[PDB]
PDB file of C-alpha atoms in Angstrom:
ATOM      1  CA  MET A   1      21.273  40.295 -30.089  1.00 47.83           C
ATOM      2  CA  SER A   2      17.873  41.141 -31.553  1.00 47.18           C
ATOM      3  CA  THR A   3      16.573  37.879 -33.012  1.00 44.33           C
ATOM      4  CA  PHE A   4      17.358  35.883 -29.861  1.00 43.08           C
ATOM      5  CA  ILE A   5      15.882  38.463 -27.482  1.00 40.77           C
ATOM      6  CA  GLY A   6      12.768  38.477 -29.659  1.00 41.59           C
ATOM      7  CA  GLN A   7      12.359  34.717 -29.951  1.00 39.35           C
ATOM      8  CA  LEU A   8      12.735  34.226 -26.229  1.00 37.85           C
ATOM      9  CA  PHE A   9      10.517  37.206 -25.504  1.00 37.22           C
ATOM     10  CA  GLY A  10       8.140  34.834 -27.251  1.00 35.69           C
ATOM     11  CA  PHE A  11       9.385  31.770 -25.322  1.00 34.53           C
ATOM     12  CA  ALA A  12       8.507  33.582 -22.107  1.00 33.94           C
ATOM     13  CA  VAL A  13       4.873  34.031 -23.155  1.00 34.07           C
ATOM     14  CA  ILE A  14       4.787  30.403 -24.320  1.00 32.44           C
ATOM     15  CA  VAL A  15       5.825  28.895 -21.019  1.00 31.01           C
ATOM     16  CA  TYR A  16       3.783  31.474 -19.124  1.00 36.06           C
ATOM     17  CA  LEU A  17       0.911  30.032 -21.154  1.00 33.73           C
ATOM     18  CA  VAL A  18       1.891  26.509 -20.116  1.00 32.23           C
ATOM     19  CA  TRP A  19       2.414  27.269 -16.418  1.00 29.81           C
ATOM     20  CA  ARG A  20      -0.867  29.180 -16.138  1.00 26.26           C
ATOM     21  CA  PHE A  21      -3.127  26.744 -17.996  1.00 24.54           C
ATOM     22  CA  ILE A  22      -2.011  23.352 -19.245  1.00 25.71           C
ATOM     23  CA  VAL A  23       0.348  21.665 -16.796  1.00 24.85           C
ATOM     24  CA  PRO A  24      -2.012  22.527 -13.893  1.00 26.33           C
ATOM     25  CA  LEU A  25      -4.661  20.674 -15.910  1.00 27.85           C
ATOM     26  CA  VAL A  26      -2.554  17.596 -16.623  1.00 28.21           C
ATOM     27  CA  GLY A  27      -1.528  17.778 -12.980  1.00 25.41           C
ATOM     28  CA  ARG A  28      -5.194  17.450 -12.074  1.00 23.43           C
ATOM     29  CA  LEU A  29      -5.616  14.538 -14.472  1.00 22.07           C
ATOM     30  CA  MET A  30      -2.461  12.560 -13.694  1.00 20.90           C
ATOM     31  CA  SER A  31      -3.123  13.112  -9.999  1.00 19.45           C
ATOM     32  CA  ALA A  32      -6.540  11.529 -10.545  1.00 17.99           C
ATOM     33  CA  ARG A  33      -5.102   8.639 -12.559  1.00 20.16           C
ATOM     34  CA  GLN A  34      -2.456   8.008  -9.896  1.00 20.22           C
ATOM     35  CA  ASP A  35      -5.166   8.173  -7.224  1.00 21.40           C
ATOM     36  CA  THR A  36      -7.169   5.500  -9.025  1.00 21.96           C
ATOM     37  CA  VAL A  37      -4.461   2.831  -9.093  1.00 20.55           C
ATOM     38  CA  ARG A  38      -3.404   3.840  -5.576  1.00 18.05           C
ATOM     39  CA  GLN A  39      -6.962   3.240  -4.378  1.00 18.01           C
ATOM     40  CA  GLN A  40      -7.214  -0.061  -6.236  1.00 18.80           C
ATOM     41  CA  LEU A  41      -4.028  -1.427  -4.724  1.00 20.10           C
ATOM     42  CA  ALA A  42      -5.349  -0.287  -1.343  1.00 17.73           C
ATOM     43  CA  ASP A  43      -8.489  -2.227  -2.265  1.00 17.98           C
ATOM     44  CA  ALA A  44      -6.413  -5.322  -3.030  1.00 20.63           C
ATOM     45  CA  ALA A  45      -4.838  -4.964   0.407  1.00 19.90           C
ATOM     46  CA  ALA A  46      -8.331  -4.662   1.915  1.00 20.12           C
ATOM     47  CA  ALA A  47      -9.435  -7.738  -0.020  1.00 22.35           C
ATOM     48  CA  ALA A  48      -6.605  -9.896   1.313  1.00 25.88           C
ATOM     49  CA  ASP A  49      -7.508  -8.352   4.661  1.00 25.53           C
ATOM     50  CA  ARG A  50     -11.063  -9.619   4.331  1.00 21.57           C
TER      51      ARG A  50
ATOM     52  CA  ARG B   1      -1.157  -7.946 -17.211  1.00 21.70           C
ATOM     53  CA  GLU B   2      -0.475  -7.733 -13.453  1.00 20.24           C
ATOM     54  CA  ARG B   3      -2.983  -4.925 -12.852  1.00 16.44           C
ATOM     55  CA  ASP B   4      -5.870  -6.724 -14.520  1.00 19.59           C
ATOM     56  CA  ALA B   5      -4.836  -9.936 -12.746  1.00 21.01           C
ATOM     57  CA  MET B   6      -4.711  -7.883  -9.545  1.00 21.28           C
ATOM     58  CA  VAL B   7      -8.223  -6.504  -9.476  1.00 17.16           C
ATOM     59  CA  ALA B   8      -9.462  -9.720 -11.091  1.00 15.16           C
ATOM     60  CA  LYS B   9      -8.157 -11.714  -8.113  1.00 13.54           C
ATOM     61  CA  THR B  10      -9.540  -8.888  -5.954  1.00 17.06           C
ATOM     62  CA  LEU B  11     -13.121  -9.464  -7.052  1.00 15.85           C
ATOM     63  CA  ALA B  12     -12.341 -13.195  -7.015  1.00 10.82           C
ATOM     64  CA  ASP B  13     -11.313 -13.092  -3.356  1.00  7.78           C
ATOM     65  CA  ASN B  14     -14.361 -11.022  -2.502  1.00  9.31           C
ATOM     66  CA  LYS B  15     -16.214 -13.942  -4.076  1.00  8.88           C
ATOM     67  CA  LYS B  16     -14.151 -16.335  -1.950  1.00  5.17           C
ATOM     68  CA  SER B  17     -14.637 -14.094   1.094  1.00  5.35           C
ATOM     69  CA  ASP B  18     -18.396 -14.299   1.271  1.00  6.75           C
ATOM     70  CA  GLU B  19     -18.353 -17.925   0.112  1.00  5.71           C
ATOM     71  CA  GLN B  20     -16.202 -18.775   3.143  1.00  4.40           C
ATOM     72  CA  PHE B  21     -18.477 -16.596   5.276  1.00  2.00           C
ATOM     73  CA  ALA B  22     -21.411 -18.712   4.110  1.00  2.00           C
ATOM     74  CA  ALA B  23     -19.503 -21.968   4.663  1.00  2.00           C
ATOM     75  CA  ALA B  24     -19.151 -20.895   8.295  1.00  2.00           C
ATOM     76  CA  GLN B  25     -22.910 -21.089   8.899  1.00  2.00           C
ATOM     77  CA  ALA B  26     -23.068 -24.050   6.519  1.00  2.00           C
ATOM     78  CA  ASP B  27     -21.116 -26.541   8.560  1.00  3.13           C
ATOM     79  CA  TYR B  28     -22.018 -24.831  11.823  1.00  2.38           C
ATOM     80  CA  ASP B  29     -25.625 -25.801  11.156  1.00  2.00           C
ATOM     81  CA  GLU B  30     -24.383 -29.141   9.831  1.00  2.17           C
ATOM     82  CA  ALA B  31     -22.502 -29.885  13.058  1.00  2.00           C
ATOM     83  CA  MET B  32     -25.264 -28.760  15.386  1.00  2.00           C
ATOM     84  CA  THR B  33     -28.044 -30.582  13.539  1.00  2.00           C
ATOM     85  CA  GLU B  34     -25.887 -33.690  13.643  1.00  2.00           C
ATOM     86  CA  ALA B  35     -25.681 -32.981  17.368  1.00  2.00           C
ATOM     87  CA  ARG B  36     -29.465 -32.639  17.611  1.00  2.00           C
ATOM     88  CA  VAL B  37     -30.214 -35.930  15.871  1.00  2.00           C
ATOM     89  CA  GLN B  38     -27.456 -37.473  17.979  1.00  2.00           C
ATOM     90  CA  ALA B  39     -28.879 -36.157  21.261  1.00  2.00           C
ATOM     91  CA  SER B  40     -32.340 -37.382  20.264  1.00  2.00           C
ATOM     92  CA  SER B  41     -31.137 -40.673  18.792  1.00  2.00           C
ATOM     93  CA  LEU B  42     -29.608 -41.135  22.189  1.00  2.00           C
ATOM     94  CA  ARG B  43     -32.198 -40.774  24.961  1.00  2.00           C
ATOM     95  CA  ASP B  44     -34.709 -42.388  22.622  1.00  2.23           C
ATOM     96  CA  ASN B  45     -32.765 -45.637  22.512  1.00  2.63           C
ATOM     97  CA  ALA B  46     -32.661 -45.178  26.286  1.00  2.00           C
ATOM     98  CA  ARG B  47     -36.449 -44.893  26.536  1.00  2.34           C
ATOM     99  CA  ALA B  48     -36.849 -47.869  24.176  1.00  3.21           C
ATOM    100  CA  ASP B  49     -34.667 -50.346  26.051  1.00  4.03           C
ATOM    101  CA  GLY B  50     -36.186 -48.864  29.164  1.00  3.45           C
ATOM    102  CA  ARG B  51     -39.502 -50.283  28.024  1.00  2.00           C
ATOM    103  CA  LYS B  52     -37.609 -53.454  27.151  1.00  2.00           C
ATOM    104  CA  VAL B  53     -36.782 -53.982  30.788  1.00  6.35           C
ATOM    105  CA  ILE B  54     -40.112 -52.621  32.094  1.00  5.99           C
ATOM    106  CA  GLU B  55     -41.913 -55.409  30.297  1.00  7.93           C
ATOM    107  CA  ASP B  56     -39.542 -58.293  30.938  1.00  7.90           C
ATOM    108  CA  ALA B  57     -39.419 -57.378  34.640  1.00  6.94           C
TER     109      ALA B  57
END
């Protein structure tokens, strides 16, 4: 099958693209945005503490 | 709605935290100054009616 082998020869470079560049980046960002609300709920705990 | 309420109450209970901290010294000083004017209201009445009896004796 030529057309399928070609289109997924492309698909390979596409998700190589995504696994090298983009999802590491959104991993950075969503890790940060999870860290923020995590820290703020920890801060609420510390506030009831105080 | 719960997150903004959450950190809103958080800063609000920091507010309440140091306001209670201040109230500590507030009525501490209140109590002990009451005690001072009590301890000197007493022992001055004592001196006064002391002179009462000094003079009538």
